[PDB]
Amino acid sequence: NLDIIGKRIEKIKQEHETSWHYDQDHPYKTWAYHGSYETKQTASSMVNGVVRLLTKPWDIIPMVTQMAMTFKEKVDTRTQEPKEGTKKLMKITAEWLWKELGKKKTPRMCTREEFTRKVRSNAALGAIFNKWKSAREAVEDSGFWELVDKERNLHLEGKCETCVYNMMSRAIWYMWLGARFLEFEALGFLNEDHWFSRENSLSGVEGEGLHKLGYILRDVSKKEGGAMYADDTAGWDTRITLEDLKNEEMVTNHMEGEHKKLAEAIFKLTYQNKVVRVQRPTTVMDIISRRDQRGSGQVVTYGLNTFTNMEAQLIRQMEGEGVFKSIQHLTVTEEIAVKNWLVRVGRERLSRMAISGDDCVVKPLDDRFASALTALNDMGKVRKDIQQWEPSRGWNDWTQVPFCSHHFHELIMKDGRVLVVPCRNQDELIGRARISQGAGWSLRETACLGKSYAQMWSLMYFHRRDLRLAANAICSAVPSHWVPTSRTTATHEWMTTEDMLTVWNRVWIQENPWMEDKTPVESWEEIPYLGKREDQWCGSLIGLTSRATWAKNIQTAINQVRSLIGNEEYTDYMPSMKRFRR
Ligand SMILES: CC(=O)NCc1cn[nH]c1
Ligand SMILES: [Zn+2]
């Protein structure tokens, strides 16, 4: 408790010594509360006018238009201590999993140089504004690095002064850039060196890309076994136990020297003990603490979520296969049985999964998995939207399984070759492309964000009639040479000024390990669509009068946007489609 967080608390006390008051009407039950101080401040979603002017039919679709308008009673909940048998299963599994992940990788520190390059090309490193304006400026000033050094030597001493979270089914815990650096220095290797790649982790998909996820799910479907299970957890980040955080910390067992000590300090001082500042309108700033739940940088959160989800799903698989009888207590011979299962079939069982942070798809040996719930519930990974003890419903067809907010279609090209393509309800895609985040967007910056969405649609969603047409229209409306942008950045092959047909060929043909015939596609007309009825099922407006008028008059919409942007160099991409090809 207060020996580890006291220093951080003491320091904040003094910078607001004219405001410190131990409030009596504090709303916290599961968070430890320490005091309050005076503040007064808040970033809503803005519409992208380039995308909206080129998607007129969707102006009257509420699922699209409502997306642009507008649980902290789940962050304030508590998770019970797992039973001794559960804790044993998790420790054995975690020990075995870090060794497997470490077989072909070497833990290492990430560098000021690496951190500096990241910031100088905009990655969402959840930092705060003070002394320097942006992250870009702090990184060039040697005063910052002297602050970093003071904290670093403090961490080596087993103490913390400035690693404090700022709070803001979503919850993002910003820290000052210095704290983020020290986290990246110790644990950045997990992401930077691809520990959760599919080649390295067998269950993972880190770096895989939306054009690969469908092929990965189809490969899992080819295994002998039961239904495909895709159970979502109710608020995964809030269900991370102190036992989970202790099994995650065992990655430090694979480290040495300085690194081992720096990593151990991040786990002890920032993850297993946390200090947070929250805005309350009653507007004061609350300084609260707790030991458990997830609150790291988003990128370390992704890797440790993937790790602990892989662990939980192997244990649920063990339960279905009858490897252990009860979570109350593992016998001595059950421990040897669990260890022996992992050595004998662990890697095979990992290959039966696709795991992306809190999101999973499992194809178990058989459907006993469906009612194997005791370990999963006792670890605190309670399933969303189903009663605690009600057996999971599995999917009989890999094309119906939800994963990473998508489903996947099998699409046969006129030439016989097989594409496995990502899909989701088209209102979601159009509604997201119509939204920007943040202030001070020029017309040129807004146009370049529209072009980023258009090129993503050309590469990932070319099989949706409305998106291929809207992508061609946006790319026709934005100057040919303007570079696509995004203020918050998997593999983003659409972020380029290269011709999108050349990029399509590289991604779907040349570099696609599931495509044996490498014959390049010569035109967009060789590239197929979903069936017309399937396109409507997934939200297409094909068949509506609104959509027919839009498609027929598209050059008028394109001209409207060109007239606003001004006298620039434009390309007509519409004749890449049959119906505009005269
Ligand atoms: C309709 C269109 O192409 N407008 C572009 C433009 C603006 N000024 N001169 C040409
Ligand atoms: Zn610290």
Ligand SMILES: [Zn+2]
């Ligand atoms: Zn679909």
